[PDB]
Each structure stands twice: as C-alpha cells, then as structure tokens.
Amino acid sequence: AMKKVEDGNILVFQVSMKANKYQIKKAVKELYEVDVLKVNTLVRPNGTKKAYVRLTADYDALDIANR
Amino acid sequence: KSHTLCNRCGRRSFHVQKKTCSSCGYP
Amino acid sequence: LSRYVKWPEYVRVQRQKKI
Amino acid sequence: AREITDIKQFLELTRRADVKTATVKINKKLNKAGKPFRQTKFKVRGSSSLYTLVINDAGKAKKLIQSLPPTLKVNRL
Amino acid sequence: ANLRTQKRLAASVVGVGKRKVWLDPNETSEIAQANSRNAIRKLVKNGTIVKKAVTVHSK
Amino acid sequence: KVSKSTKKFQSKHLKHTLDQRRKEKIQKKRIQGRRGNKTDQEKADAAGTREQQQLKKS
RNA sequence: GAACGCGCGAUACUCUUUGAACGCACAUUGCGCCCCUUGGUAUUCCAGGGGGCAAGCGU
RNA sequence: AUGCCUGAAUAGGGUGAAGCCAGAGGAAACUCUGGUGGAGGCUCGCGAAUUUGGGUAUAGUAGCAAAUAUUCAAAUGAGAACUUUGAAGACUGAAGUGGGGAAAGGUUCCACGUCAACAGCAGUUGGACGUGGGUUAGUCGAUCCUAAGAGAUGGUUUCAAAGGCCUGACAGGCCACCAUCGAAAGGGAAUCCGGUUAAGAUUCCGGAACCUGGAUAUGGAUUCUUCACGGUAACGUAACUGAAUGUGGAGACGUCGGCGCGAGCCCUGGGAGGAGUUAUCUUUUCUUCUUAACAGCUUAUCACCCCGGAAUUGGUUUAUCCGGAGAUGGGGUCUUAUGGCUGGAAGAGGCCAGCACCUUUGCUGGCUCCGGUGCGCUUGUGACGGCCCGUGAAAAUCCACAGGAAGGAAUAGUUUUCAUGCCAGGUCGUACUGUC
C-alpha cells in the first residue's frame, strides 16, 4: 500500500461494508481536501473493504500521506 | 449436497429441492 | 366471448332478485 | 485513431483551446523506386481521437514545422 | 541456500520455463539475495543467470 | 492425420457404442429364430382387407 | 432463536443483518415506488441523508 | 417405466442405394459396360439394451499402505539417500506427468521463522505449524428476459368492481387481461495491445477505443418565404416532421454430405543475425525476422433490374438442374461477410553487438526484409444437394412500414435518424486448486 502511495499516486484506505464508490470518493474529498480521480474497491477475505483512491495529478499522494 | 444453510436457524438443514428446512421448518 | 364482465356480481344479484 | 490528409485541418486542430502537445515522428523508409527517404508524421489528439498527418516531402514537413504555433509543445520523436 | 523461488522468478522473467534456466553454482550467495524480479533481471544481465538454447535436434 | 473429433469420440464414446452394437447384434440373432416377431405392415398383409375377410369367413 | 462484529451493538465487555418478520424477491447483500432535504456548474443530470409502502335497468 | 426444457456429443475405416452422363443389344419395356453420385435395420475396430451436465415433472512379529531409476560434485545445516545448485542417466510425448474453466473446497496462493505433532523411514522440505501480505471492472460474469415447470391473487384467469392513458376556454372517450419465481452452458450494448508483483490483471499502469443515458450549443440542410432531390428500373443521399391505430424484420432455432473462399497452425526458398558439430565429409542442424481492439478508403458469390426474344435446343455443376411464368448474350443495382492499403505503429515486442560499476549499473549503435505451397489439421463462412419434422423454444430488446392527427415565418419560423462539441456510469464475484 505504501509503495502504491509513493509511486502510483494512490491512497489505500479501509472502508465500511455499506459504502459505495460515490460515498468513498466524497468522504475522501471532504476529509482530506483532495481531488479524486477514481476509486476501486474490493472486499477482503476477513470481511473488510479496501479502497484504492487515485487522486488527480494536481496532488502528490506522498504529501497527503505525510500530512 | 442435498442441504444448505438455513437462514432462520443457521444449520445445514435447508433442502435445496424442497426449499424447506428439516430442523426448524422454514418457512 | 364472456360479456358478463359488464355487470359486477352485486348488480347482477340485485337484478336477479328483481325477477 | 484517425488519419488526415489536410494540412490546414491539422493546423486548426493544434490551434484549439484544449490542445496539449503535438508529436513529430521521423521514419527512414524506402519508396517503390528503391531510393530511401524521410517520412514525417505529425500527431495531435482532438477531443476523443488521435489525428495523424503523414508527409513524404521534406520541404513541406519543414514548412509545416515552421508554421506550428510557437506556444505549442512539440515532441521530437 | 534455497534458490527455488529464484529459479521460478528467472523462468518467469526470461519466459523459457524452469528447464531452460541456468543458475551459477559458484554464485549461490549472490543469487540467494535476489528476492525480487528486478534483482533477477540484474542477475540475468550480469550473466549469473543464463538462458539455455533450444536443443539442436532435427525435426 | 487424425481429426480432433475422431480423437474425442474414440477417447469418450467408443466403448459403450461397441457394447451397444454387440448387444443389438446378440438380441437380433436371438430373436431371428423365434416365432411371433413381425412388422405392422406384414401383420396387415397377413390379416388382409375386409373383403378378403368376408371371403375367408364364407 | 440465528448470522456478523466490539456482556454489548458502529454510542458495541443506542440497539448491525435477520427471525411471527411486513414494499417486492431471495440459496442473490437483487429489484422498485412515494414524500422531504443537502451537495456537486444545475429547472432537467448525478449522488448522499431522513421518513414511508405486508357503483347499481335495487327500492 | 415414461417423460419435458436448455446445452455438449452423435467421430473414423470399408462397402457403394436411388438419380445422372457416355456407350453396346432390343420395336418399347428393359438388360449389360465404364464413370459419376454419396444413401442405409449395410459392415469393422411379447421380451434385453439404448452417451452426458444443469433444470424440472408424472512381537520388534505380520508387514512398509505398491505409481518404474537413479549416480557424481558443491552449498546450507548439530545432523543430508530424501533440502538447494550444477553435471549425467531416465520418463510423460499435444488422446501429456502440458496450460485453463463450471461445480465444489475456503486461504490450501506468496514471503519470513520452526520441526512439538502430521505428511505409516527420515527430513534443514511442506497443501504442517506461528506471523504477516495478497483478490482493484461502464466494456468479463451475475444483475435483465423468458423455457419446461413451479406458484400468489378471486386450482393459474376462473360468473373478481383486478388498470393505465387521452380530450376539454368534472364530463366524455380508448384499450383489453393478469402477479411473481425459474438458466454464472439458453437470448444479451460496449476494450484491446504492451508492461508491471514475492503473490494482482481483458480489473492495475501507459497508450489507444468503444457503449448507453442526459442537458445543451454551433455549422449545414429544411431553396421564396413553410416537411429536399436524382435514376426507365433495381436503387442512391450529409440531412430531408409524423399522433392514435394496424403490421413487418432482427432476436429466432433439426441433422448430414461434397464443393468454393478467408484466417491460425504445419511445410518451404533467398537474405540479415545468434548458437551447436567438424579425426574425415557436410554452402550443414537449432533459433529471431511479430502487428491487437478500433477507425477511413476500396473490394462479392447470391439475389434483383433494363434491353432482347430462344428448336439445328442451348446454358451449366464434383453432384442434371434451369429457360415464353422469358434462357444464352449485353449492360447495371445491392448486402460488406471477407481480403488489400493506411492510421493505431514501431515510439511497442524480438534478435544481436559494444561501453560503463567493490553500488538501481543502465547507456549507446544496428537488423527486424522479400516470397512459394495444400485430398494437410483447427476454425469461420457462401451457394447448393440429401433425409427427418410442429414452417423446427419463448421472452426481454432494437429497427422499420402503412396511416394522416398536429405544428411551422418578418430584429433569430419548424425539425435536428447530417456534422462537431460537454458530463456520467452504482452493488456483488475476481487469490489458489479443480462430476462436466
């Protein structure tokens, strides 16, 4: 996940079972004040949801991870 | 594989063909 | 055809009692 | 992808508000006469397509290169 | 000195199966540190890991 | 060169096909000598028409 | 009574998904409709939230 | 025992039935001879049997758990017949001991550490143990539709008041017919290539592209002001309004045979590289020389149209079928399946050679070209011919046709199936193995 953050400009988050891509995108935008390019969500074997939120080129994911 | 999970009781007693449970009788 | 659907049951019964 | 044979159409494509970059690609290839020559492809992508202009004439390619907007980024090869 | 994963990665990177890869018997320690495909590619470039040619047998 | 369909059939269906062929041959041989096995057309030919039947009754 | 979670239920050592179980289906986290409201350029679009849906040839 | 719905399979060798062609005998009927053709209760490897998935009805003894072949050197480790690397010997031999899927299993996938138990000797090994990491979709499936059948409403549309829509400065009018479930093999809108991880890919990254829905703007057309033209015709077009109502097409449909064509594979010549063998001979043996979805131009057998009027009967298939119900012949129209050129695209991928370093140590330079072939295998497709038979499942979905309701002009008339431009695409499955 940290490799994706520093290389792919993608923040990897854990979200709830009841959240869809719209809600994840809006929550990321509101909580971290960043522009979201796309959201890709999967369901993990342990019953949790993992979301790859790729931000726009105007933002550096390393800066948001450090901040 | 004659039986599957029953929603009402959680046992492997829901007959797939009959669509009835042999342990709690659902529904 | 089946034209009886032009009369509901209550209308038909209340007209049968008229006879 | 689309191919265009019109030079002024290519110039109009590169003059729009939403233009990012134009690519100039050089190919050293032989013609049917057997003498090799220099072929230049000018590529710019419009709204949803990539338009390519192929020029087999060196002088025309030089003139088109000189006629490109000075504020347009050009990728050499 | 357990280079099973190294052989698997070399076969995958070179794409010639595990029957065509050659790991240097005199460089066990160096190959043992190649835990990633980038290191496998570096070893192949350096000649520590080599790709064997197809058998010379008439059709 | 053997075709793919031939390979598939010989690998899958040859044995039971041969067994059923053998059983059919055995049954036909067994009932060849029995009496009481006739086709419908042959039964009608032996029965004859109506007029043939009044002729026989007379 | 069951499932999933931290005795308890997202306020988790108020009350998730269900169950007589109730919008419709169901071996699916599938498919709708209605009313209010909020946001993203916004009268149209998209999404989020709250609350709901088991007349007469008679007198 | 008999079934029903939707799929897979129904192969190969041999023989050679009708029908047809050319001959001979005969007044015909016919009978022989050669070919063609490719059929079957044909053969080969009252009774029995009649492929298959999903759905759905009526004593430290016996013994070693049996699947063949192992050997040498080195590394790790306290410990090596069993772990790892190299060398040798051997095996599966595309109908695999090779790569994937449905179902099913549920973390068995990957990494690190370990041998208390387990893997019927051992083990430093593991489908074991302990700790972590890993499954990314507008385009692939489910989700949608209906099939046999199941099943609410009052047994499956029945003596049920079972519902929506339209018109008009509440009344009138139109129409009929029943919910829902049931397929990850049936029907169905749309994505490809390259690269990338220890474990993820049509899902990620780069490039390139399509589908559906929506609001809108601009250009063009709608030519005197009001819904456009051309050709004898088949029909062509950048457009070129169209209500109720009534229809048509696609979806949408048995099986077999030969013939023609395309693609992938196989075979093969020259040349440009790299590798092997060489006591002797061998211009020699192996390997690289690739082009995706999508897009533009062009390209057709069949069918149809026009002229014309045919016996001295012609045309013609491998298969004897066609012509005054219009042949041969001459000239045209159409479907774009499928080839060709081009963009995507050489910048990718591949094969080489050279120069840098106790290190992520990547930089540079070349070649990636031109052809031939078929009772060959795989697959798609076209026109036919044969046989069985309900004219060969239904529905969602898209399109068109008749009809003539209504609407359209003087500081932006009407339409926008022509062109360009804007936005968006949720939920669940995705790791690994694997009776059909």
PDB file of C-alpha atoms (C1' of nucleotides) in Angstrom, chain H residues 102-254:
ATOM      1  C1'   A H 102     -18.166 -24.735 -14.253  1.00  0.00           C
ATOM      2  C1'   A H 103     -19.300 -27.061  -9.702  1.00  0.00           C
ATOM      3  C1'   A H 104     -17.014 -27.986  -5.085  1.00  0.00           C
ATOM      4  C1'   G H 105     -13.316 -26.725  -1.418  1.00  0.00           C
ATOM      5  C1'   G H 106     -12.133 -21.875   1.682  1.00  0.00           C
ATOM      6  C1'   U H 107      -6.681 -19.146   2.387  1.00  0.00           C
ATOM      7  C1'   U H 108      -4.826 -24.780   0.699  1.00  0.00           C
ATOM      8  C1'   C H 109      -1.883 -18.625  -3.106  1.00  0.00           C
ATOM      9  C1'   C H 110       3.176 -15.587  -1.503  1.00  0.00           C
ATOM     10  C1'   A H 111       7.056 -14.338   1.999  1.00  0.00           C
ATOM     11  C1'   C H 112       9.681 -14.962   6.692  1.00  0.00           C
ATOM     12  C1'   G H 113      10.966 -18.394  11.072  1.00  0.00           C
ATOM     13  C1'   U H 114      10.384 -23.687  13.146  1.00  0.00           C
ATOM     14  C1'   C H 115      10.382 -29.108  13.364  1.00  0.00           C
ATOM     15  C1'   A H 116       6.360 -30.396  19.405  1.00  0.00           C
ATOM     16  C1'   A H 117       2.695 -33.205  16.442  1.00  0.00           C
ATOM     17  C1'   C H 118       1.211 -34.671  10.988  1.00  0.00           C
ATOM     18  C1'   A H 119       2.847 -35.901   5.657  1.00  0.00           C
ATOM     19  C1'   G H 120       2.762 -45.032   8.039  1.00  0.00           C
ATOM     20  C1'   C H 121      11.683 -44.495   7.259  1.00  0.00           C
ATOM     21  C1'   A H 122      13.993 -39.739   7.603  1.00  0.00           C
ATOM     22  C1'   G H 123      13.753 -34.711   6.747  1.00  0.00           C
ATOM     23  C1'   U H 124      17.022 -28.493   7.390  1.00  0.00           C
ATOM     24  C1'   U H 125      11.269 -29.894   2.979  1.00  0.00           C
ATOM     25  C1'   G H 126       5.781 -28.949   3.176  1.00  0.00           C
ATOM     26  C1'   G H 127      -1.387 -28.176   0.943  1.00  0.00           C
ATOM     27  C1'   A H 128       2.055 -28.832   8.733  1.00  0.00           C
ATOM     28  C1'   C H 129       2.953 -25.104  12.498  1.00  0.00           C
ATOM     29  C1'   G H 130       3.446 -19.386  14.033  1.00  0.00           C
ATOM     30  C1'   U H 131       3.297 -14.162  11.988  1.00  0.00           C
ATOM     31  C1'   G H 132       2.138 -11.191   8.138  1.00  0.00           C
ATOM     32  C1'   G H 133       0.895  -9.855   2.673  1.00  0.00           C
ATOM     33  C1'   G H 134      -2.356 -10.690  -1.200  1.00  0.00           C
ATOM     34  C1'   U H 135      -8.154 -10.896  -4.944  1.00  0.00           C
ATOM     35  C1'   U H 136      -8.875  -3.314  -7.864  1.00  0.00           C
ATOM     36  C1'   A H 137     -14.039  -3.806 -13.937  1.00  0.00           C
ATOM     37  C1'   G H 138     -19.086   1.402 -17.559  1.00  0.00           C
ATOM     38  C1'   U H 139     -16.802  -2.947 -21.527  1.00  0.00           C
ATOM     39  C1'   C H 140     -15.544 -10.397 -18.243  1.00  0.00           C
ATOM     40  C1'   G H 141     -19.926 -12.730 -15.389  1.00  0.00           C
ATOM     41  C1'   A H 142     -24.068 -12.180 -12.011  1.00  0.00           C
ATOM     42  C1'   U H 143     -27.755  -8.241 -12.030  1.00  0.00           C
ATOM     43  C1'   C H 144     -32.201  -8.034 -17.171  1.00  0.00           C
ATOM     44  C1'   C H 145     -35.512 -11.855 -20.132  1.00  0.00           C
ATOM     45  C1'   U H 146     -38.185 -15.982 -20.562  1.00  0.00           C
ATOM     46  C1'   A H 147     -38.095 -22.049 -21.308  1.00  0.00           C
ATOM     47  C1'   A H 148     -40.155 -26.970 -19.046  1.00  0.00           C
ATOM     48  C1'   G H 149     -42.330 -26.232 -14.606  1.00  0.00           C
ATOM     49  C1'   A H 150     -43.389 -24.076 -10.012  1.00  0.00           C
ATOM     50  C1'   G H 151     -46.608 -20.513  -7.524  1.00  0.00           C
ATOM     51  C1'   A H 152     -49.800 -15.709  -5.132  1.00  0.00           C
ATOM     52  C1'   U H 153     -54.427 -13.249  -6.143  1.00  0.00           C
ATOM     53  C1'   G H 154     -60.544 -14.407  -6.632  1.00  0.00           C
ATOM     54  C1'   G H 155     -56.865 -24.565  -8.893  1.00  0.00           C
ATOM     55  C1'   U H 156     -53.476 -20.460 -12.677  1.00  0.00           C
ATOM     56  C1'   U H 157     -57.741 -16.416 -15.236  1.00  0.00           C
ATOM     57  C1'   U H 158     -61.822 -18.689 -13.031  1.00  0.00           C
ATOM     58  C1'   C H 159     -69.786 -15.590 -13.199  1.00  0.00           C
ATOM     59  C1'   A H 160     -63.460 -10.933  -9.310  1.00  0.00           C
ATOM     60  C1'   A H 161     -65.944  -3.775  -9.263  1.00  0.00           C
ATOM     61  C1'   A H 162     -58.251  -6.896 -10.764  1.00  0.00           C
ATOM     62  C1'   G H 163     -55.693  -0.538 -14.765  1.00  0.00           C
ATOM     63  C1'   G H 164     -53.432   2.854 -17.277  1.00  0.00           C
ATOM     64  C1'   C H 165     -53.984   6.679 -20.718  1.00  0.00           C
ATOM     65  C1'   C H 166     -56.265  10.654 -23.577  1.00  0.00           C
ATOM     66  C1'   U H 167     -59.547  15.182 -24.768  1.00  0.00           C
ATOM     67  C1'   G H 168     -61.538  19.654 -22.715  1.00  0.00           C
ATOM     68  C1'   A H 169     -61.959  28.450 -22.828  1.00  0.00           C
ATOM     69  C1'   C H 170     -65.966  17.357 -13.600  1.00  0.00           C
ATOM     70  C1'   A H 171     -67.805  15.366 -18.071  1.00  0.00           C
ATOM     71  C1'   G H 172     -66.676  12.395 -22.193  1.00  0.00           C
ATOM     72  C1'   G H 173     -63.648   8.616 -24.604  1.00  0.00           C
ATOM     73  C1'   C H 174     -59.812   4.150 -25.689  1.00  0.00           C
ATOM     74  C1'   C H 175     -57.984  -0.491 -24.675  1.00  0.00           C
ATOM     75  C1'   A H 176     -58.215  -5.222 -23.181  1.00  0.00           C
ATOM     76  C1'   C H 177     -56.051  -9.257 -19.329  1.00  0.00           C
ATOM     77  C1'   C H 178     -53.169 -10.691 -15.253  1.00  0.00           C
ATOM     78  C1'   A H 179     -48.587 -11.030 -10.079  1.00  0.00           C
ATOM     79  C1'   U H 180     -44.067 -13.369  -9.188  1.00  0.00           C
ATOM     80  C1'   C H 181     -40.213 -17.320  -9.351  1.00  0.00           C
ATOM     81  C1'   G H 182     -37.409 -20.372 -12.618  1.00  0.00           C
ATOM     82  C1'   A H 183     -30.510 -20.686 -16.776  1.00  0.00           C
ATOM     83  C1'   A H 184     -22.866 -17.841 -13.904  1.00  0.00           C
ATOM     84  C1'   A H 185     -23.859 -23.754 -20.727  1.00  0.00           C
ATOM     85  C1'   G H 186     -30.133 -20.515 -23.498  1.00  0.00           C
ATOM     86  C1'   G H 187     -31.346 -14.776 -25.524  1.00  0.00           C
ATOM     87  C1'   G H 188     -27.975 -10.300 -24.215  1.00  0.00           C
ATOM     88  C1'   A H 189     -24.927  -2.617 -25.563  1.00  0.00           C
ATOM     89  C1'   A H 190     -19.915  -1.728 -25.358  1.00  0.00           C
ATOM     90  C1'   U H 191     -11.832  -2.962 -24.547  1.00  0.00           C
ATOM     91  C1'   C H 192      -7.655  -4.057 -26.974  1.00  0.00           C
ATOM     92  C1'   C H 193      -2.203  -4.292 -27.103  1.00  0.00           C
ATOM     93  C1'   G H 194       2.340  -3.683 -24.265  1.00  0.00           C
ATOM     94  C1'   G H 195       4.311  -3.544 -19.387  1.00  0.00           C
ATOM     95  C1'   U H 196       4.132  -4.423 -14.292  1.00  0.00           C
ATOM     96  C1'   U H 197       4.192  -8.135  -8.416  1.00  0.00           C
ATOM     97  C1'   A H 198       7.197 -12.434  -3.819  1.00  0.00           C
ATOM     98  C1'   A H 199       1.873 -13.434  -4.587  1.00  0.00           C
ATOM     99  C1'   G H 200      -2.867  -8.970  -8.694  1.00  0.00           C
ATOM    100  C1'   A H 201      -4.844  -8.449 -14.441  1.00  0.00           C
ATOM    101  C1'   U H 202      -9.285  -8.320 -20.864  1.00  0.00           C
ATOM    102  C1'   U H 203      -9.734  -5.316 -13.495  1.00  0.00           C
ATOM    103  C1'   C H 204      -3.556  -2.051 -12.039  1.00  0.00           C
ATOM    104  C1'   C H 205      -0.003   1.430 -15.128  1.00  0.00           C
ATOM    105  C1'   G H 206       0.898   3.668 -20.455  1.00  0.00           C
ATOM    106  C1'   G H 207      -1.235   4.272 -24.972  1.00  0.00           C
ATOM    107  C1'   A H 208      -5.324   3.629 -27.915  1.00  0.00           C
ATOM    108  C1'   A H 209     -11.135   2.864 -28.357  1.00  0.00           C
ATOM    109  C1'   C H 210     -15.986   1.826 -27.998  1.00  0.00           C
ATOM    110  C1'   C H 211     -21.409   1.538 -25.470  1.00  0.00           C
ATOM    111  C1'   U H 212     -25.687   3.673 -23.085  1.00  0.00           C
ATOM    112  C1'   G H 213     -28.338   7.739 -20.963  1.00  0.00           C
ATOM    113  C1'   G H 214     -28.819  13.190 -20.404  1.00  0.00           C
ATOM    114  C1'   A H 215     -28.797  18.506 -20.933  1.00  0.00           C
ATOM    115  C1'   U H 216     -27.371  21.734 -24.496  1.00  0.00           C
ATOM    116  C1'   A H 217     -24.547  24.950 -28.171  1.00  0.00           C
ATOM    117  C1'   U H 218     -22.531  25.749 -33.120  1.00  0.00           C
ATOM    118  C1'   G H 219     -22.305  24.668 -38.538  1.00  0.00           C
ATOM    119  C1'   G H 220     -25.430  22.583 -42.533  1.00  0.00           C
ATOM    120  C1'   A H 221     -29.942  21.349 -44.613  1.00  0.00           C
ATOM    121  C1'   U H 222     -35.217  22.446 -44.417  1.00  0.00           C
ATOM    122  C1'   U H 223     -34.131  26.869 -51.853  1.00  0.00           C
ATOM    123  C1'   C H 224     -39.481  32.342 -51.893  1.00  0.00           C
ATOM    124  C1'   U H 225     -40.646  32.533 -47.667  1.00  0.00           C
ATOM    125  C1'   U H 226     -43.440  26.515 -44.894  1.00  0.00           C
ATOM    126  C1'   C H 227     -41.671  18.900 -44.183  1.00  0.00           C
ATOM    127  C1'   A H 228     -35.140  18.148 -50.145  1.00  0.00           C
ATOM    128  C1'   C H 229     -33.689  15.627 -54.660  1.00  0.00           C
ATOM    129  C1'   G H 230     -31.657  12.066 -58.700  1.00  0.00           C
ATOM    130  C1'   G H 231     -32.145   7.257 -61.893  1.00  0.00           C
ATOM    131  C1'   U H 232     -36.670   3.733 -67.225  1.00  0.00           C
ATOM    132  C1'   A H 233     -35.617   0.447 -63.202  1.00  0.00           C
ATOM    133  C1'   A H 234     -33.125  -2.385 -59.322  1.00  0.00           C
ATOM    134  C1'   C H 235     -31.897   1.832 -56.089  1.00  0.00           C
ATOM    135  C1'   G H 236     -28.606   6.207 -54.421  1.00  0.00           C
ATOM    136  C1'   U H 237     -28.219  10.614 -50.429  1.00  0.00           C
ATOM    137  C1'   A H 238     -24.773  14.560 -45.232  1.00  0.00           C
ATOM    138  C1'   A H 239     -29.845  15.774 -43.641  1.00  0.00           C
ATOM    139  C1'   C H 240     -34.775  15.688 -45.505  1.00  0.00           C
ATOM    140  C1'   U H 241     -41.505  16.498 -39.292  1.00  0.00           C
ATOM    141  C1'   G H 242     -45.016  12.450 -38.437  1.00  0.00           C
ATOM    142  C1'   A H 243     -50.469  11.033 -33.114  1.00  0.00           C
ATOM    143  C1'   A H 244     -53.995   7.397 -32.320  1.00  0.00           C
ATOM    144  C1'   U H 245     -54.379   2.905 -34.859  1.00  0.00           C
ATOM    145  C1'   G H 246     -52.767  -1.708 -37.783  1.00  0.00           C
ATOM    146  C1'   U H 247     -48.427  -4.589 -39.368  1.00  0.00           C
ATOM    147  C1'   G H 248     -43.169  -6.396 -40.816  1.00  0.00           C
ATOM    148  C1'   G H 249     -37.841  -7.605 -39.736  1.00  0.00           C
ATOM    149  C1'   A H 250     -33.727  -8.908 -36.392  1.00  0.00           C
ATOM    150  C1'   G H 251     -33.675 -11.582 -31.540  1.00  0.00           C
ATOM    151  C1'   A H 252     -35.340 -16.902 -33.619  1.00  0.00           C
ATOM    152  C1'   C H 253     -33.755 -22.064 -33.856  1.00  0.00           C
ATOM    153  C1'   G H 254     -33.376 -30.120 -36.945  1.00  0.00           C
TER     154        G H 254
END
